[PDB]
Amino acid sequence: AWNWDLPKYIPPPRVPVDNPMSEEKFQLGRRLFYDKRLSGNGTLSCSSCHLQERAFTDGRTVSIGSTGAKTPRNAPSIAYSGWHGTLTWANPALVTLERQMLNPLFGADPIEMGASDANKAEIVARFRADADYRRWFAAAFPEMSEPISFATIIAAISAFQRGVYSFDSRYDHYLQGEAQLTEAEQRGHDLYFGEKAECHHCHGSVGLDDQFVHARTREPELPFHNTGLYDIDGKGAYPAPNHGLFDITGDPDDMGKFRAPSLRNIALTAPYMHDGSVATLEEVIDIYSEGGRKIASGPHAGDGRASALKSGLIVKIDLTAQEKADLLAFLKTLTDESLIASPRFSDPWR
Ligand code: HEC
Ligand code: HEC
Numbered sequence: 272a273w274n275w276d277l278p279k280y281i282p283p284p285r286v287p288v289d290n291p292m293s294e295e296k297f298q299l300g301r302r303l304f305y306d307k308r309l310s311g312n313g314t315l316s317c318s319s320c321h322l323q324e325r326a327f328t329d330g331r332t333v334s335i336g337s338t339g340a341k342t343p344r345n346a347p348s349i350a351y352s353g354w355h356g357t358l359t360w361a362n363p364a365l366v367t368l369e370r371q372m373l374n375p376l377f378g379a380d381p382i383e384m385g386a387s388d389a390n391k392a393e394i395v396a397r398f399r400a401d402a403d404y405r406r407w408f409a410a411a412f413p414e415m416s417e418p419i420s421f422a423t424i425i426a427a428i429s430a431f432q433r434g435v436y437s438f439d440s441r442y443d444h445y446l447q448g449e450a451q452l453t454e455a456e457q458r459g460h461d462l463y464f465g466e467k468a469e470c471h472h473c474h475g476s477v478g479l480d481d482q483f484v485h486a487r488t489r490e491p492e493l494p495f496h497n498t499g500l501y502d503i504d505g506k507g508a509y510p511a512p513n514h515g516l517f518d519i520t521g522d523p524d525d526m527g528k529f530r531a532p533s534l535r536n537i538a539l540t541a542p543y544m545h546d547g548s549v550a551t552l553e554e555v556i557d558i559y560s561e562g563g564r565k566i567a568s569g570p571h572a573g574d575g576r577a578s579a580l581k582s583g584l585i586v587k588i589d590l591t592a593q594e595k596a597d598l599l600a601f602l603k604t605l606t607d608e609s610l611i612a613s614p615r616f617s618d619p620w621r
């Protein structure tokens with residue numbers, strides 16, 4: 272029977288009623304997440320792009336799929352993903368990890384894991400060909416005649432992902448009362464939650480996002496935001512291939528709108544932004560201070576501070592070098608102790 276083991280302030284996540292949590296399901300998912308044999312040609316596991324060492328992200332601006340194509344976007348973290356209202360960077364239709372998983376697995380455009388109908392069965396057989404995997408699926412899905420399929424692979428990995436969290440940060444300790452925040456950290460903190468810096472509007476939930484969804488959430492929030500990273504045409508256009516919410520609705524005023532990412536482990540998940548185009552957290556704050564980014568040079572040139580689509584809440588906010596460092600100091604309190612080195616989420620294959 273699954274113990275959530277949550278702080279007071281985190282309610283349990285919504286679990287799809289036909290895929291209940293269990294420890295057998297968790298460990299199977301962990302083995303499959305890290306197994307290079309789930310990809311079409313056997314070169315990549317999920318963990319290739321979602322490294323533990325980096326809070327389950329890549330360290331690269333974009334990622335490299337199993338046939339060697341680049342992804343159009345930066346690989347976000349999978350930690351805490353059980354609480355995300357909408358999964359990836361800009362898609363209101365992906366609202367379940369089970370559903371989302373089909374993209375990395377079967378998506379071409381571009382190939383990531385590289386599972387097609389041509390190799391579908393071949394992959395599955397690889398797990399039936401294995402002694403240890405037969406125990407696991409069997410022990411995890413006991414009500415099933417044939418318990419190694421793709422519905423079973425998705426269910427397991429989904430369970431694993433819901434088990435990936437540790438509300439372990441200095442910020443979390445602070446909120447529980449086990450820790451005092453630094454003078455710098457307090458001053459960054461008061462900025463973050465103040466109507467000058469404004470970060471709590473979009474990064475101010477206990478998930479440090481504004482799409483926090485648990486198992487009690489009714490009438491969910493779900494907003495998206497243009498933050499003025501670009502204005503390619505002088506009309507607020509973001510460069511192809513990343514239009515954000517526009518790419519799904521076709522509505523012109525959703526151009527450059529993205530989900531606000533959770534800021535948990537932000538210190539560890541650089542590069543930043545939807546396309547990895549901001550190298551450091553110092554440059555991020557520079558950008559918020561100016562109400563947007565100005566690209567002075569080449570193909571991406573334009574000024575996002577002046578974009579028409581930009582959010583109401585991002586204005587020019589002349590923050591002093593002091594206030595910027597205090598705010599940077601506060602973002603560094605959002606890294607987890609456990610997560611990066613816990614045996615629980617480590618590669619089980621060595
Ligand atoms: C070679 C690259 C690559 C592989 C392989 C890959 N991912 Fe991803 N992952 C991405 C990128 C890039 C995104 C961002 C997608 C987007 O919005 O365009 C992503 C997004 C996600 C998200 C949404 C997270 C959020 O915060 O909303 C989850 C969950 C996820 N991946 C899990 C998986 C699982 C499970 C596997 C394989 C079993 C997998 N990933 C394989 C690169 C990859
Ligand atoms: C009204 C919306 C809004 C406000 C205000 C806002 N953000 Fe964001 N933030 C976003 C969105 C949306 C993105 C993703 C944008 C993209 O990649 O195109 C983002 C991206 C980020 C990233 C990179 C995240 C990642 O996972 O790669 C950091 C760091 C960040 N914000 C911190 C801040 C700080 C610090 C403030 C204010 C002091 C702030 N934000 C104010 C919505 C906002």
Ligand SMILES: [Ca+2]
Nearest residue numbers: 540541542543
């Ligand atoms: Ca990143």
